Enzyme design. Structure first.
Site, PDB file in Angstrom:
ATOM      1  CG  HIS A  40      44.769  40.526  32.743  1.00 55.78           C
ATOM      2  ND1 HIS A  40      45.862  41.272  32.357  1.00 55.78           N
ATOM      3  CD2 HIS A  40      43.891  40.592  31.708  1.00 55.78           C
ATOM      4  CE1 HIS A  40      45.653  41.781  31.156  1.00 55.78           C
ATOM      5  NE2 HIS A  40      44.463  41.383  30.739  1.00 55.78           N
ATOM      6  CB  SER A  49      46.081  41.346  27.711  1.00 58.67           C
ATOM      7  OG  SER A  49      45.578  42.610  28.149  1.00 58.67           O
ATOM      8  CG  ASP A  95      48.733  40.940  34.328  1.00 55.57           C
ATOM      9  OD1 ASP A  95      48.273  39.780  34.417  1.00 55.57           O
ATOM     10  OD2 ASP A  95      48.248  41.787  33.562  1.00 55.57           O
TER      11      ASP A  95
END
Ligand SMILES: *P(=O)(O)[C@H](Cc1ccccc1)NC(=O)[C@@H]1CCCN1C(=O)[C@@H](NC(=O)CCC(=O)O)C(C)C
Length: 224
Positions: free
Chosen positions: A44, A181, A88
């Protein structure tokens, strides 16, 4: 990182800071060096242009330990699902190999199919926000506890125990958060997870991509 502390400078030499797309600030994520020419992060975090910074502590200062390299290829997992945030994971092949040294070096990866016991203490690090009101210029880290899949299974609709890890005790105000992230979840010094997603509140448990489930794809991509 919420509820953590500033890392001893240059003590996690595999950490990578990603600047995604122009202008300088279009989007940011963390990542970690897995080979001299490859960084592992979250799919992402994909962008058309990604500038990777290795060797940093304070990312707002020109430090002499820093190496800035552009990603030559950004390889998202073939089945990444942006809607459910599943699979992801992404590999960034660097345009040039890093100059390996004490401040810049790869982190060990787990053996394929290696699981993780609930209750295990792990460490996550990053340059993400520390609260809804503020961020940080320097690397921080926090220790989080691995949760039973069962718990995430009941909280997040698209959770898959085979490909993800449920992380963080709701009772503690400790968690990876916005900007973290792509960072690693280090469990007994091996990169077992990748910061993926959670609640907007930052309240745990949150979801990490389970690295050991993607070893064959990782190995294929780096070899080929
Ligand atoms: P990363 O981009 O820095 C981010 C990290 C994070 C971890 C824990 C809590 C909040 C953020 N990840 C994200 O922002 C990911 C990728 C886009 C969507 N996403 C979010 O995690 C979103 N949460 C969910 O979709 C679950 C919401 C819920 O069940 O309440 C939003 C944007 C926080």
């Amino acid at each position: 990182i919420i509820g953590g502390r500033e890392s001893r400078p240059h003590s996690r030499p595999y950490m990578a800071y990603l600047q995604i797309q122009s202008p300088a600030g279009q989007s940011r994520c963390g990542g970690f060096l897995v080979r001299e020419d490859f960084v592992l992060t979250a799919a992402h975090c994909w962008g058309s242009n990604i500038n990777v910074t290795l060797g940093a502590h304070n990312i707002q200062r020109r430090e002499n330990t820093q190496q800035h390299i552009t990603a030559r290829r950004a390889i998202r997992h073939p089945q990444y699902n942006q809607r459910t945030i599943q699979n992801d994971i992404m590999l960034l092949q660097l345009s040039r190999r890093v100059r390996r040294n004490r401040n810049v070096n790869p982190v060990a990866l787990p053996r394929a199919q290696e699981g993780l016991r609930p209750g295990t203490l792990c460490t996550v690090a990053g340059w993400g926000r520390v609260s809804m009101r503020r961020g940080t210029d320097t690397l921080r880290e926090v220790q989080l506890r691995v949760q039973r899949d069962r718990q995430c299974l009941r909280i997040f609709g698209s959770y898959d125990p085979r490909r993800q890890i449920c992380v963080g005790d709701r009772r503690e105000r400790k968690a990876a958060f916005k900007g973290d992230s792509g960072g690693p979840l280090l469990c007994n010094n091996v990169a077992h997870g990748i910061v993926s997603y959670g609640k907007s509140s930052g309240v745990p448990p949150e979801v990490f991509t389970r690295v050991s489930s993607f070893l064959p794809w990782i190995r294929t991509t780096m070899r080929s």
